[PDB]
Amino acid sequence: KLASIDAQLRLLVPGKVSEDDKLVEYDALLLDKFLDILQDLHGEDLKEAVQQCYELSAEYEGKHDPKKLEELGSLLTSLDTGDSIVIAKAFSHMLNLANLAEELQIAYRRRIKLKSGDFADEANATTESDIEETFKRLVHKLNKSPEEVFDALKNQTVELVLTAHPTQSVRRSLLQKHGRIRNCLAQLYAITPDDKQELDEALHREIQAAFRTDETPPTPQDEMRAGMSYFHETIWKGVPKFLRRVDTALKNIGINERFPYNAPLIQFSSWMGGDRDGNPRVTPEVTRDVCLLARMMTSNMYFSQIEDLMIEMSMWRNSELRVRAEELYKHYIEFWKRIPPNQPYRVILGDVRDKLYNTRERSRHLLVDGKSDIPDEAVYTNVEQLLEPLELCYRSLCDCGDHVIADGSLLDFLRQVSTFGLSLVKLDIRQESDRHTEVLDAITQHLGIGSYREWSEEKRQEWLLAELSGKRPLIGPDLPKTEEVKDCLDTFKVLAELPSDCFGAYIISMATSTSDVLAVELLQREYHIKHPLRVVPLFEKLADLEAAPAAMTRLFSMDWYRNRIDGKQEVMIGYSDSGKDAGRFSAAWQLYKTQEQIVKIAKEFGVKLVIFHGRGGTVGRGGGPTHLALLSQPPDTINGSLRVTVQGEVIEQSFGEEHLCFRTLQRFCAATLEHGMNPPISPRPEWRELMDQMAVVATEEYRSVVFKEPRFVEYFRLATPELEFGRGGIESLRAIPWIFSWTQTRFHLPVWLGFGAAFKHAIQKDSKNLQMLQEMYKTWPFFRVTIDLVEMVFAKGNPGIAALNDKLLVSEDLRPFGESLRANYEETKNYLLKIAGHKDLLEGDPYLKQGIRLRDPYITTLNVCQAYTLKRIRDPNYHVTLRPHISKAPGLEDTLILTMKGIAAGMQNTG
Amino acid sequence: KLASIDAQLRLLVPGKVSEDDKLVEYDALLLDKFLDILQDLHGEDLKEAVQQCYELSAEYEGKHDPKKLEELGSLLTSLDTGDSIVIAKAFSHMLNLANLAEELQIAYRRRIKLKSGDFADEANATTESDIEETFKRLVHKLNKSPEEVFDALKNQTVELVLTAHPTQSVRRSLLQKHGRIRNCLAQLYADITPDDKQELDEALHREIQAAFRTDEIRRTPPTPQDEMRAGMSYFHETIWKGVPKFLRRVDTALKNIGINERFPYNAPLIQFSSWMGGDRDGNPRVTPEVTRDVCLLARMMTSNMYFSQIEDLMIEMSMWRCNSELRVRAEELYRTHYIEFWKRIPPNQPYRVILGDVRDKLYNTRERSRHLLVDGKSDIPDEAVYTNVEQLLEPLELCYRSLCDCGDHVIADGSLLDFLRQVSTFGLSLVKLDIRQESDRHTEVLDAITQHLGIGSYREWSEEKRQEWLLAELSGKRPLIGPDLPKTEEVKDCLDTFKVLAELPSDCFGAYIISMATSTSDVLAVELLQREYHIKHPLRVVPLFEKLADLEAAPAAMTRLFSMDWYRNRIDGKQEVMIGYSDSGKDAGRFSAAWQLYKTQEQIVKIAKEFGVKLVIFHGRGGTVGRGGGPTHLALLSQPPDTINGSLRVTVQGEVIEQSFGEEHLCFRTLQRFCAATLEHGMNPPISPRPEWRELMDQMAVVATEEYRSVVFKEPRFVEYFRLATPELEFGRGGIESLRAIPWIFSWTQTRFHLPVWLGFGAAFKHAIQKDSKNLQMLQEMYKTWPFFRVTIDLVEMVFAKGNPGIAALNDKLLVSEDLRPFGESLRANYEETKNYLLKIAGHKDLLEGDPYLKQGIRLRDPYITTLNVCQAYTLKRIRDPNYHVTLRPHISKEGLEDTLILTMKGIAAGMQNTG
Numbered sequence A: 001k002l003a004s005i006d007a008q009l010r011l012l013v014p015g016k017v018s019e020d021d022k023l024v025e026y027d028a029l030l031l032d033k034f035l036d037i038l039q040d041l042h043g044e045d046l047k048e049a050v051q052q053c054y055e056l057s058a059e060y061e062g063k064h065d066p067k068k069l070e071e072l073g074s075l076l077t078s079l080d081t082g083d084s085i086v087i088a089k090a091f092s093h094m095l096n097l098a099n100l101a102e103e104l105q106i107a108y109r110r111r112i113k114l115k116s117g118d119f120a121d122e123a124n125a126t127t128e129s130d131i132e133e134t135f136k137r138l139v140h141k142l143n144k145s146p147e148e149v150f151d152a153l154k155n156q157t158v159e160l161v162l163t164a165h166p167t168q169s170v171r172r173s174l175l176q177k178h179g180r181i182r183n184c185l186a187q188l189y190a191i192t193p194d195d196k197q198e199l200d201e202a203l204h205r206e207i208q209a210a211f212r213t214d215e216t217p218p219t220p221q222d223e224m225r226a227g228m229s230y231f232h233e234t235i236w237k238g239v240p241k242f243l244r245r246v247d248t249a250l251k252n253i254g255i256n257e258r259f260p261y262n263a264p265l266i267q268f269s270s271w272m273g274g275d276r277d278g279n280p281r282v283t284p285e286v287t288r289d290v291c292l293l294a295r296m297m298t299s300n301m302y303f304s305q306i307e308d309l310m311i312e313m314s315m316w317r318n319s320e321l322r323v324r325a326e327e328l329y330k331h332y333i334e335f336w337k338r339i340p341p342n343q344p345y346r347v348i349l350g351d352v353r354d355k356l357y358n359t360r361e362r363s364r365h366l367l368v369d370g371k372s373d374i375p376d377e378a379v380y381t382n383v384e385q386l387l388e389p390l391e392l393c394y395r396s397l398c399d400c401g402d403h404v405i406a407d408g409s410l411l412d413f414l415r416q417v418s419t420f421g422l423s424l425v426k427l428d429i430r431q432e433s434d435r436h437t438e439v440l441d442a443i444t445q446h447l448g449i450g451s452y453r454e455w456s457e458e459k460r461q462e463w464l465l466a467e468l469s470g471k472r473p474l475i476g477p478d479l480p481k482t483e484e485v486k487d488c489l490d491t492f493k494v495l496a497e498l499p500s501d502c503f504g505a506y507i508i509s510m511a512t513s514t515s516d517v518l519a520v521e522l523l524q525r526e527y528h529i530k531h532p533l534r535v536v537p538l539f540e541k542l543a544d545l546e547a548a549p550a551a552m553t554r555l556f557s558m559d560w561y562r563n564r565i566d567g568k569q570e571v572m573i574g575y576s577d578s579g580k581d582a583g584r585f586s587a588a589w590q591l592y593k594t595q596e597q598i599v600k601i602a603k604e605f606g607v608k609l610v611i612f613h614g615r616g617g618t619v620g621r622g623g624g625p626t627h628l629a630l631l632s633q634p635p636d637t638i639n640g641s642l643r644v645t646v647q648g649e650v651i652e653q654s655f656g657e658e659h660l661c662f663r664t665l666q667r668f669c670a671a672t673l674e675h676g677m678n679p680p681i682s683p684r685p686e687w688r689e690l691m692d693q694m695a696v697v698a699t700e701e702y703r704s705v706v707f708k709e710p711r712f713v714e715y716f717r718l719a720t721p722e723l724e725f726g727r728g729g730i731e732s733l734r735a736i737p738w739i740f741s742w743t744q745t746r747f748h749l750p751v752w753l754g755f756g757a758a759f760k761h762a763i764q765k766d767s768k769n770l771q772m773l774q775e776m777y778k779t780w781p782f783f784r785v786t787i788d789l790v791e792m793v794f795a796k797g798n799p800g801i802a803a804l805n806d807k808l809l810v811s812e813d814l815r816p817f818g819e820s821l822r823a824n825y826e827e828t829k830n831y832l833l834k835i836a837g838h839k840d841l842l843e844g845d846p847y848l849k850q851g852i853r854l855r856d857p858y859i860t861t862l863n864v865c866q867a868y869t870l871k872r873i874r875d876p877n878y879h880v881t882l883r884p885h886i887s888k889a890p891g892l893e894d895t896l897i898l899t900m901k902g903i904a905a906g907m908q909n910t911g
Numbered sequence B: 001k002l003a004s005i006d007a008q009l010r011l012l013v014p015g016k017v018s019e020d021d022k023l024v025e026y027d028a029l030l031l032d033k034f035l036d037i038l039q040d041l042h043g044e045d046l047k048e049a050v051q052q053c054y055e056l057s058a059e060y061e062g063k064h065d066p067k068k069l070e071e072l073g074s075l076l077t078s079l080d081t082g083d084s085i086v087i088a089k090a091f092s093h094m095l096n097l098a099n100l101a102e103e104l105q106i107a108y109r110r111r112i113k114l115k116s117g118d119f120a121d122e123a124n125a126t127t128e129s130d131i132e133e134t135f136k137r138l139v140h141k142l143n144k145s146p147e148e149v150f151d152a153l154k155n156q157t158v159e160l161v162l163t164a165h166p167t168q169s170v171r172r173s174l175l176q177k178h179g180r181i182r183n184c185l186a187q188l189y190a191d192i193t194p195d196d197k198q199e200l201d202e203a204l205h206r207e208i209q210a211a212f213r214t215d216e217i218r219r220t221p222p223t224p225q226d227e228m229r230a231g232m233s234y235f236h237e238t239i240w241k242g243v244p245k246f247l248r249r250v251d252t253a254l255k256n257i258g259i260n261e262r263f264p265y266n267a268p269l270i271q272f273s274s275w276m277g278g279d280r281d282g283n284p285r286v287t288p289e290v291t292r293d294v295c296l297l298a299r300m301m302t303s304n305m306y307f308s309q310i311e312d313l314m315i316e317m318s319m320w321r322c323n324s325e326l327r328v329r330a331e332e333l334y335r336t337h338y339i340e341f342w343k344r345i346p347p348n349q350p351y352r353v354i355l356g357d358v359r360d361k362l363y364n365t366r367e368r369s370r371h372l373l374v375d376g377k378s379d380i381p382d383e384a385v386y387t388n389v390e391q392l393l394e395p396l397e398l399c400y401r402s403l404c405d406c407g408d409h410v411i412a413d414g415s416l417l418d419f420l421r422q423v424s425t426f427g428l429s430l431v432k433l434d435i436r437q438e439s440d441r442h443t444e445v446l447d448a449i450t451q452h453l454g455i456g457s458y459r460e461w462s463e464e465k466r467q468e469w470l471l472a473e474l475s476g477k478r479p480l481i482g483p484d485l486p487k488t489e490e491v492k493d494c495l496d497t498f499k500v501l502a503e504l505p506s507d508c509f510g511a512y513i514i515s516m517a518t519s520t521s522d523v524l525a526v527e528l529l530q531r532e533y534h535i536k537h538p539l540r541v542v543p544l545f546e547k548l549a550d551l552e553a554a555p556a557a558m559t560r561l562f563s564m565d566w567y568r569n570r571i572d573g574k575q576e577v578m579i580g581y582s583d584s585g586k587d588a589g590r591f592s593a594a595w596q597l598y599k600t601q602e603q604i605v606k607i608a609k610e611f612g613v614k615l616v617i618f619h620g621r622g623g624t625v626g627r628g629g630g631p632t633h634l635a636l637l638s639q640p641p642d643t644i645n646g647s648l649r650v651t652v653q654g655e656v657i658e659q660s661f662g663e664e665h666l667c668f669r670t671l672q673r674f675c676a677a678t679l680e681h682g683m684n685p686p687i688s689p690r691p692e693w694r695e696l697m698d699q700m701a702v703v704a705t706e707e708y709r710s711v712v713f714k715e716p717r718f719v720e721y722f723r724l725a726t727p728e729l730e731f732g733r734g735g736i737e738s739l740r741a742i743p744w745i746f747s748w749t750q751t752r753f754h755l756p757v758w759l760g761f762g763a764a765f766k767h768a769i770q771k772d773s774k775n776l777q778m779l780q781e782m783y784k785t786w787p788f789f790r791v792t793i794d795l796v797e798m799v800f801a802k803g804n805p806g807i808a809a810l811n812d813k814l815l816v817s818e819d820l821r822p823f824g825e826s827l828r829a830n831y832e833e834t835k836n837y838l839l840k841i842a843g844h845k846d847l848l849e850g851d852p853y854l855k856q857g858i859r860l861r862d863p864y865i866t867t868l869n870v871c872q873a874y875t876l877k878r879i880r881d882p883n884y885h886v887t888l889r890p891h892i893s894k895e896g897l898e899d900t901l902i903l904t905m906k907g908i909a910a911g912m913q914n915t916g
């Protein structure tokens, strides 16, 4: 029955049916209910068709018989456009279901009571240290006093920077539906029979509601609002829950005070409407809009919880607040008459409410009108104005003997205010160096002094330092401006006009020089920005990384810059970007080294350095693995301040479920604290040498395939949906489409290519290297974590899918090239297994393996569907006999979009 | 009330109060009930006194405030002889209670579901591989086919040799009481109606009391015969049934890896043996008559056990369908004073007709042994009795086949298969007896012969001359011993031992171990004495090489034996050699013995191979392999490559038998890990040491042995210190070279100081680290990566957890003269430095942080052990110094010193269990 579907699913994932392992059951239950829904909505035949795709696809994943893939192919090419959309919709939705189930399983999986203490424990959610356990290791194993631990945490800073979903920001409505499905599932395993019957019917109903929210592309403004949804869903509440647990952990190590409510321990930021790199749709107007939206939403969140705080704050008992209440003494849900003065905390909070309302309304009018007449004194323009009256309530309760009450909801609110400020996320701006060069070259030519672009690096620096202390402005009204130059100058206009608490960093993409950084500083001074954004270079190519040290050295040598920077500098690294240039192995090692070198240079100059981790690192995986990934960082690269990218495709895993949200915040904080007092071992010299030797080879293999093979590009454009995803060659292609196109094929070339040659050569040069590599794997956190990510990527790989795409889409003369990349994949995988000490992929993480494995049949169905869809899109003369319509003006591009989104939702993070 | 004692116990063992962790509760409950008992039996004041010793002792262990030890001292020296016995009795009994509770805790502790696969997992009961998981690692990780695994297990042999409790063999009656206490405790945590709880509470109470009042200490120590019977008790209690339970699990594991047959009932996988009444080494009370007696007892008990279960098998075997082979046999027997089948069996009950005959035969076998034992002879003839195991199997195999042939395979594989396995494992004698005697006794015997024959003095002869004469007489054409040979009592005792071997059936015996073996000739000497007595089936001769120098000369000695045609022909492809960790460690220090023993086994393995001889290394006491529990499992897997090779033979030390076999689950798991580890090791050897490691180990051995020997043998006043700091002399009821290993370990264990286990490790580590700072890291890698090194360090770490330099310091204040105290002081500094070095090498801050369940177990015992230590210390002052006086309190109990000391010594030994 349900028993039958359960049995089916267990053939792919068998063995240890323990008591907290319910994942297969959850999946069975959801799939069962969804198959009924499909029958009701679309008819028995369609249900049977979906069931048959699933079955065929399961059998192919079980035994890997390519006849099975071909059968599923036949079935799928025969479907008319309409049936084909329903099938793609069905399997995408099954994926979202399996992901909700898996989150529930990770949320309730049992922790290991006794931990071995090896660093490997920190790779796994069930064994990793929580905040208390981290405190205790630091006190007992590293001989820190509890006070020292407390003091470091007080000064610590963790900043999570949210980026756009590369394929599909899940809309607010749907995400809530996903939440309720998950909750109904949870509650079903808590239970009276009638409750079960009712929950059962409520589950059924929510699965359907989700499926039928299934309606061209979205505005960046809307993409921003969709990306902010997780605040409401979890983070908003989660921050105070986690800070409260810090309090408890501090108490359990002998610290008899709460973690101060205004320690800036957690900060969130955003690139959404800020990053315009290679993206001219992100205009100045978009930037202004998302700043106002962030401000609107934050005030609105405070406003919509302040009435609850006012109810709870009924107390009648200090003179400081008494006085304020007396001074102060309509269209709202709760306190719509004047508050009486015998309710003093409500008089204060009543004023805070009104002010919050006015702050929210100004932003709304600024947004939809263009201006508002609402004045500064009616509104909060700075976060201290909002804290102040809340601190007053806190103190008044303490002075009147009610400390204990103060530390309830009021303390929660104080923390939310301190963490989220007036703008939930501070926005980073990002733009590429060449755009700044263009802007300056327009200025220099118009001024008649030559062409900045033609100038040497020394000349650029000399001219920029002279104009950074210039007495005249640079830009006259008659400066002629291309659209691109205007768009870049008007971005600074927007920075000059919006409050500084809207913004974080100005990241320079494709940075290579001292002058790139100075260029942006000059444009900010020219716009007279009261509080210039800090300037952060992103060095992308290997060569750029190699030139970064000399570039920072020079910046830090310049009096004007040192004085401006005030002891602090941030530098950004992008793992996926560097891996596109050099292969992932060589980018990993180079990035390790570069960070060492820049840390040393910072120290020498008495500058505190923050490394901002862009996408594609081990640290962006989420979950347990992020925890060891953080502790693997080179010594002193964190030093009390973490700034990391939370990748769009991981946001749901990290923050969709309340427990996972809590644990994400916890491991980021725990890991940051620990690393500064307990660095991973530094590598043995033999390891460096071998890693250098392996980098040279890995880069040679990767580059010879990706850049020197004259037909690589052509192979890429056929074997991969890259071109269709649009809706020079590889050097010019951006990192996201690179990773994505190969992830859609289940092949992942960008992640593993180069590791094969590195290993083969090392082991062939000297047999003893195998053992050295294995020791590196057991003992060197950096190496372990590097290998693990790639191992996780191979578990999501299926060379049979790549083969099928070759048969359908690649011309015959390219097929053997494809075949040879598949042999490289196999050989690379096997070398990685031998180094990891494993027979099977992920035998060190069987819960992850199970999760990925349950997804495969669904993903595979979408892959097969996609492959034929691309055949049809690409070739209007390919046709087959379509079956008479099975279901009860929408095209092939629509089916492909569903396919791409479904695969990406099942593939989640890779490289 | 009970909540109060619980709180008190948790201060010593705090933290992770999970749901299967009930040890503290068990202990609180037992202590609570026992305090009531003490009130009833001896009065409130005595209860308060016991409570106050406990409390004072708990606080001392918690915070180690020496004021608290001094208070306990004052209290304990004030007690008259009578009060003092009651207190010592009370605290010993508490220990026995805490051990029962701890067993229950180990029995029910939850297994880890997901194992990391590191070998460290096999050090711990909760993570170690069971038999199925061992099968699956061998199939999937070492690429063995299931058939290959099955075939190796079929050919495998695991032999456990049981030795006497060195301090006190627990009598059969008391052990059963301990069992029922444990069961009542178990049942209290099952379900539970309030009246059941009230009834179990009252039953628990009553058993604790029964056990406490089985407390005669008698003038005569126990006869070796009685010591043997007490040592056999565990068979009835657990092992008898446990063997078939475990073999059945092997069946289930085999099935789960795709083998569709049961493990054959007659594969000799498990064998038990004994030294009790067989070892006469340094022990003239173990006479020929004793040996004869325990063989007949072993025979009597075994037949009795079969006899007393055969009636149950007969009831169950009601079936009427038999094959014609059994039909025919039944008809014969139907032509030609018990509990159950006392009328003639009818022939429509064929299986009963067969088993009826087996019963009668068992009875007669049991009775012959009894008459042989109490009369001197019996008229009962061979055909009325079983004289060989195949005769008992035969009719049981017939029943098995008949059921199979009639379609009832499934029934056959129940009780009948269990019985078949018991018969195949225990044979006609539950345990085969090893004989052991020292080489010099044989020399004495041969020297008497040679002088009396007028051909000179065997003792004066060189090794080459010994060999030459022995090989000529081993092919001699006349006997050596004439009627007029004059015989010292010792020579007679040794000759008459061979008489006893000549006369008893060969299935009574296993090995003739030669203690203090050094030579080829030592082994040939025993072989000549056996041939002279015309023993139809001579026991195999097994040398025990004890000193470092002996271990170093063993290779050349085995080479020579294996080179001699006469010996090779006699040995028929098989040789056993014995090693004794405690013995070697007495000579050379435990570190250097551990390393040397590792090397010597490598070298003898190689030599055996070269000569095409299968080698069994028999592990004497004192090794890592003797710890029991989880640690035994990694200990076995740590063995040097090919030192097991399908055949394990290890000592189960008397002080560990209770832990290994008293509780049914622990019994099962002991049998399982001995079988799992043995199978695995032959197909999955531990890594061999890197050359740097050997070099360092060699360098460290030189230094450890220098430190150990300079303290133990060259310090002129060491012996004198030892006799005052330690109860060695009183335990009696040359110098150290001449003292036996058991009293050496024991005497320092009684002081909580354990010098024999750690002495020498300090200098080894210090010197390594000072020679080159990089050695610290090498040592740490060895610890993480080299099983042998890990397991060697762990045992010493476990010993330090049992240590308390404060108790040692107190014994010095009370018993050592002023001019020797600084010597004691400097040994304590060595203990600190050694412990700290070990911790640094293990990567630990606290002792046993890698094994917190063990740490908790040892820690819950300390308050009791400490109370006994303090009591012992002042008792020894009183016994030794009649110018020490104290104001005794008026008698506290309601309703001398040597007796208190005996209780003290036994209680401390029970709580210390195994160390070195």
Ligand SMILES: N[C@@H](CC(=O)O)C(=O)O
Pocket: A621, A622, A623, A625, A653, A792, A848, A851, A906, A907, A908, A909
């Ligand atoms: N985020 C998971 C992968 C996944 O669930 O897709 C990991 O990196 O381990």
Ligand SMILES: N[C@@H](CC(=O)O)C(=O)O
Pocket: B627, B628, B629, B631, B659, B798, B854, B857, B911, B912, B913, B914
């Ligand atoms: N048998 C334990 C020690 C003990 O329980 O006393 C061990 O060796 O680990």
